[PDB]
Design a protein around this ligand. Structure first.
Ligand SMILES: [Mg+2]
Ligand SMILES: [Mg+2]
Ligand SMILES: [Mg+2]
Ligand SMILES: [Mg+2]
Ligand SMILES: [Mg+2]
Length: 150
RNA sequence: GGUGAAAUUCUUGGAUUUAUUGAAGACUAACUACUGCGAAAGCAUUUGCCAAGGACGUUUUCAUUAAUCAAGAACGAAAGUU
C-alpha cells in the first residue's frame, strides 16, 4: 500500500513545486491528487491551468498522466489544496523532474521492501527513511553511501 | 515590467517603488478658443537687442508710379544626403 508521504509531514507548504497525476476534470476545474506528497486532493482551476489560451483541456491535461505544478494556498484542518500550473518557470520543471525521480526511486525501493515483508509502509518509513532524510536531507544519497560506505 | 492574456527583460550584488539632490539633451503641458501673426511652409517659457509688417487715425506728401504675369529669381513641412 503506497501511502505515508515522502516528506516529514503529510501536508504541503506555501510556495513549493510539486508534480501531480490528474484523476478527473470538472467544469470549474480539476480536484486532483498530489504525488510529491501522499494522497491529499486539491483544485487546479482552468484559468490557472494552461499557459496559452485554454482552447482544449483534453490535449493539455491528459488525465492519468504526470504534470508539474505549484501550490498557492493550503487547508491545514482536514486537507485541501489550491494549486497552480501556468506559473511553472522553464527552470522549475527541471528541478521538479529530478526531485520526483529521486523520490520515485526511494519510494519504489521501500514499496518493494513493504511488499516482501507485508508490513505497512508507514512503520517502515518511520523506522528507516525519516532518520536518513533528517541526517542527509534525502535518503538516496544515504543509499549511495551504503553502496560505498556502510 | 507588460499585456486581451502571456512571455522576453531587471532583481536578497537587493531591483520596483522612498526622500533629497547632481548630469545630459529634448521640449515648452495646463492657459489653448469655429482666437492671433505670417507670402506659403510655419510660429506658444521669461528678458534684452536687432531690423521688419499688417490694420486704424491723418484738412500730410508724389501724381498713375498700377493688376496679372512666359524668362528669371527668394523661401519651401517631414523624410533623405555630406
Ligand atoms: Mg531602491
Ligand atoms: Mg507654456
Ligand atoms: Mg492670441
Ligand atoms: Mg514662372
Ligand atoms: Mg532632418
Amino acid at each position: 500500500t503506497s501511502h505515508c508521504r515522502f516528506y516529514e509531514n503529510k501536508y504541503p507548504e506555501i510556495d513549493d513545486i510539486v508534480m501531480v497525476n490528474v484523476q478527473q476534470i470538472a467544469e470549474m476545474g480539476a480536484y486532483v491528487k498530489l504525488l510529491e506528497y501522499d494522497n491529499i486532493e486539491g483544485m487546479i482551476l482552468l484559468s490557472e491551468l494552461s499557459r496559452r489560451r485554454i482552447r482544449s483541456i483534453q490535449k493539455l491535461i491528459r488525465v492519468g498522466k504526470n504534470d508539474v505544478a505549484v501550490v498557492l494556498r493550503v487547508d491545514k484542518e482536514k486537507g485541501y489544496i489550491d494549486l497552480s500550473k501556468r506559473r511553472v518557470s522553464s527552470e522549475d520543471i527541471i528541478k521538479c523532474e529530478e526531485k520526483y525521480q529521486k523520490s520515485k526511486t526511494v519510494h519504489s525501493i521501500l514499496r518493494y521492501c513493504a511488499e516482501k515483508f507485508q508490513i505497512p509502509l508507514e512503520e517502515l518509513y518511520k523506522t528507516i527513511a525519516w532518520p536518513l532524510s533528517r541526517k542527509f536531507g534525502h535518503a538516496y544519497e544515504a543509499f549511495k553511501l551504503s553502496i560505498i560506505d556502510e
